[PDB]
Symmetry: D2
Subunit: 114 residues, 4 copies
Amino acid sequence: ATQGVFTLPANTRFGVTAFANSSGTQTVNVLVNNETAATFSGQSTNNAVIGTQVLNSGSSGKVQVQVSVNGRPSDLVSAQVILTNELNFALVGSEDGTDNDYNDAVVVINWPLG
Amino acid sequence: ATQGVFTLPANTRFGVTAFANSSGTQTVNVLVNNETAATFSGQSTNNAVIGTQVLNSGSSGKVQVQVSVNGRPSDLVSAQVILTNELNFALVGSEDGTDNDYNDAVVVINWPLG
Amino acid sequence: ATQGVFTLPANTRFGVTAFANSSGTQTVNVLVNNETAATFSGQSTNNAVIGTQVLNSGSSGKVQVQVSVNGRPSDLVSAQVILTNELNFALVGSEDGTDNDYNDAVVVINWPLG
Amino acid sequence: ATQGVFTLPANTRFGVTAFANSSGTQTVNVLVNNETAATFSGQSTNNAVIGTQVLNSGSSGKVQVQVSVNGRPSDLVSAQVILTNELNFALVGSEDGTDNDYNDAVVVINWPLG
Ligand SMILES: C[C@@H]1O[C@H](NC(=O)c2ccc(-c3cccc(CN)c3)o2)[C@@H](O)[C@H](O)[C@@H]1O
Ligand SMILES: [Ca+2]
Ligand SMILES: [Ca+2]
Ligand SMILES: [Ca+2]
Ligand SMILES: [Ca+2]
Ligand SMILES: [Ca+2]
Ligand SMILES: [Ca+2]
Ligand SMILES: [Ca+2]
Ligand SMILES: [Ca+2]
């Protein structure tokens, strides 16, 4: 199944933050409106916050996360969770190798802000 | 129900990161084995990261998040999500006021690392 | 925090299913737009499906689960999870006593149907 | 990523329930320690419960859900959610066709029981 694609409420600010846990340098692309809106990158085996940004979900609300390691696309896993019918998290894990920890880049999207 | 309490595997490193979305200055305390192991504070209305740290679950694996504003405990909401049977997120939201957005401090715990 | 309340898309069909795990008879009421739309009662300590029904979220999309034992409301825990940006679960646990297993009645809402 | 595989605590009872939402008969296999422990078959486009059973996770704790239609493996999506650090749900969706609703057979695993 497609992973890493989330429908947010339209025209709504959201936070996006990326963590790294791999020997490989991670590159995280965040697409809004099917166009790159943010790119994060780094290399850590200790959960470094390689990037964090506030974005707007735009007219469609479609947000997509993609991860690559030296130009090679990582496999993704994702889900969305809603607490008290108000607080949203869209979660992505990615795997760049064979150990299937899916933590090589971890991405968290949260909304609402403010 | 109690919220913000998680059982991790023993002696396991985990990431904890906090974001603020409030006029109130947030204090986030992360307890491991019922003792404060990390404290973060900050104030933002725009999802600023107010702390990130890697901790060890220790012998107990008992992790608890507490949030306060002006000496008063915030009301918490929380859940744990597991993706592809491997990637764990422990998620916390907190409410310091009356609008029930539950994003006043947002805490994300993730493991495994590395 | 309020628990057991979910906003579904308006005019959407959804399933609701209740399980019991208690010495006490569970009464599960499912409200749509604040009016009772389905009720299930039963006693099980072996996860019997005390009822399942299909409903429509109607104009409001507001769906609420209540659980009581002999007229006393149980404490509720809940969350909503979305898989592959399409498949939704709204999850409820309830505690009618002191052991905090939160399984005394378990209620699962799923959509879309068909 | 692998989907539909869950690690439960060893030697623990769990509930498994399957719903159908497809014009084709669904066949759901539940494997414990890589061996068939339950099979459910049924057809509904209205969320009928096609099977429900209580199983034991046994010595391995390894539970896997597979779904096939008319012989052919359906694509799966899954996750596990824990509420109040006590109540577990393992959730599976499956897609047998072209619409990507992932509700063709829906499987819900819950523990603990009793
Ligand atoms: C009602 C819809 O049912 C769809 N499933 C099928 O159409 C399906 C399942 C197996 C077969 C089937 C078998 C044998 C030969 C053929 C070819 N005619 C086809 O068709 C679901 O995917 C969809 O979401 C909807 O619920
Ligand atoms: Ca890896
Ligand atoms: Ca890794
Ligand atoms: Ca607030
Ligand atoms: Ca706020
Ligand atoms: Ca109980
Ligand atoms: Ca019970
Ligand atoms: Ca389908
Ligand atoms: Ca279907």
